[PDB]
Amino acid sequence: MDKNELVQKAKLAEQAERYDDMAACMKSVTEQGAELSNEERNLLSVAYKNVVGARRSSWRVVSSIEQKTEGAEKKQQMAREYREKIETELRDICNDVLSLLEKFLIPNASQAESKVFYLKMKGDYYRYLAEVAAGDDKKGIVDQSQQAYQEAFEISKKEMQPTHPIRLGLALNFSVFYYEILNSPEKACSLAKTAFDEAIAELDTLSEESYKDSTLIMQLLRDNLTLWT
Amino acid sequence: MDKNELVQKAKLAEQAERYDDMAACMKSVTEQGAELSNEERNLLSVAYKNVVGARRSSWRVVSSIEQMAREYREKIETELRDICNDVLSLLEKFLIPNASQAESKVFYLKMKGDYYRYLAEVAAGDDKKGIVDQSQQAYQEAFEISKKEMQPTHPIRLGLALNFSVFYYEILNSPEKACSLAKTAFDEAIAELDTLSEESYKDSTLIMQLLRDNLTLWTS
Amino acid sequence: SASLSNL
Amino acid sequence: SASLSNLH
């Protein structure tokens, strides 16, 4: 198939809720080397968000079961080994996406909006690696994630209005990074509060195509604020 | 690995919502040739209900949209067919011949009817006929055994009437038989509520409500 | 149109 | 904690 066919198959897969197919389709599209359209970018992002999301969810369930079975070693052993099998799937998927990010998506990003999107995505998939990293390894991974978010943050702060959904969304995920990964509720709250308030101050800048997304993300930022305090 | 380990892994797979793992685990248990317990039997059934369920759901979305669609719908259908065949194979080679008890024979014959029904949902050629007939044969025999051997409030018997009545409505296009079967199953259960057990009454009453929901829809 | 799948 | 994934 060629670009157009793959992209249509990916849209088909999405509707069938067959996210591996969808991901595989968009991966191939990305590998033909051309800068993705906005439509393609979202299809890629959606595909892998679901593929990785299934593992993260399975990991937490199985990991929880593992910690709850201190004192039942046969069960705790079966849990651990299964957590590890799931973890390998999780890692391979993140490595898969980070690989597409270095080789294709980040170097080919022409406009600021795209560079923020991809750098945020990179922060995201290093964050997911950080969710399960033990080591002797954790630090370097955590660091890669913070650098990608930070670089993205600086570009969105320079280039985007505060109601832009890509910027609010970066603030959201970067703030989650601070709370969950760096364990700093104050830095998380600060980033989240700042982004919400700056958006509140400029609601007239909302567009027809963006305001739903923008205001939904704002609600998320405020929910995290409420939770975290 | 052994039975108990595999079963325990299947329970982990379920909690993780990883149904391919769950189906594979229970398939392996099934392949050891020993009759499954009630627990294991349910684990097997739940595992494949989900695996086949995803395909049935994707088929309907894609069939409806239908180009690219036709080629993809066929891909899903082949998966769907391979899954049904896997389960129907386990039923012939292991589950049905080893069903020593009447309850298991009904359960498995129902499952056989179910999985031919899922095949029938997607059969279009003159191949449909034999498949449809296969589903009815399995349903009919299970029906006869449950009437002979089970109370009308038994959840497995009520569940069979339910799916069998769905067979008449959806596959054979026969709302009158569907209603007739559903109503009889419901009324006969209503006539003997004292036969409800402690361990079963929740399932039994929920299935009755489903039967009645189907009755209501089909006569509307 | 519900089968046993609903439980 | 809610991330952008939680958007619908």
Numbering used by the authors:
A (entry chain B): 1 to 229
B (entry chain A): 1 to 66, 77 to 230
C (entry chain C): 18 to 24
D (entry chain D): 18 to 25
Publication passage describing the model:
Purified 14-3-3ζ protein was co-crystallized with the phosphorylated Cby 18-mer (12KTPPRKSA(pS)LSNLHSLDR29) and diffraction data were collected to a resolution of 2.41 Å. The 14-3-3ζ protein, which crystallized as the typical cup-shaped dimer, has the Cby peptide bound in an extended conformation to each 14-3-3 monomer. The Cby peptide occupies the conserved binding groove of 14-3-3 with the same orientation as other phosphopeptides previously characterized. Thus, each of the phosphate oxygens has 3 hydrogen bonding partners positioned in an ideal tetrahedral arrangement, explaining why mutation of S20 to D or E fails to promote high affinity binding of Cby to 14-3-3ζ. The peptide is further coordinated by hydrogen bonds between the side-chain of 14-3-3ζ-N224 with the backbone nitrogen and carbonyl of Cby-A19, the carboxamide of 14-3-3ζ-N173 to the backbone nitrogen of Cby-L21, and the side-chain of either E180 (chain-C) or W228 (chain-D) of 14-3-3ζ to the hydroxyl group on the side-chain of Cby-S18. With Cby’s S22 side-chain juxtaposed between 14-3-3ζ residues K49 and R56, the K49 side-chain is sterically hindered from contacting pS20.
Secondly, Cby facilitates β-catenin export from the nucleus in conjunction with the proteins 14-3-3 and the nuclear export receptor chromosomal region maintenance 1 (CRM1). Structurally, the ~30 kDa 14-3-3 proteins assemble into homo- or heterodimers, with each monomer composed of nine anti-parallel alpha-helices (αA-αI).
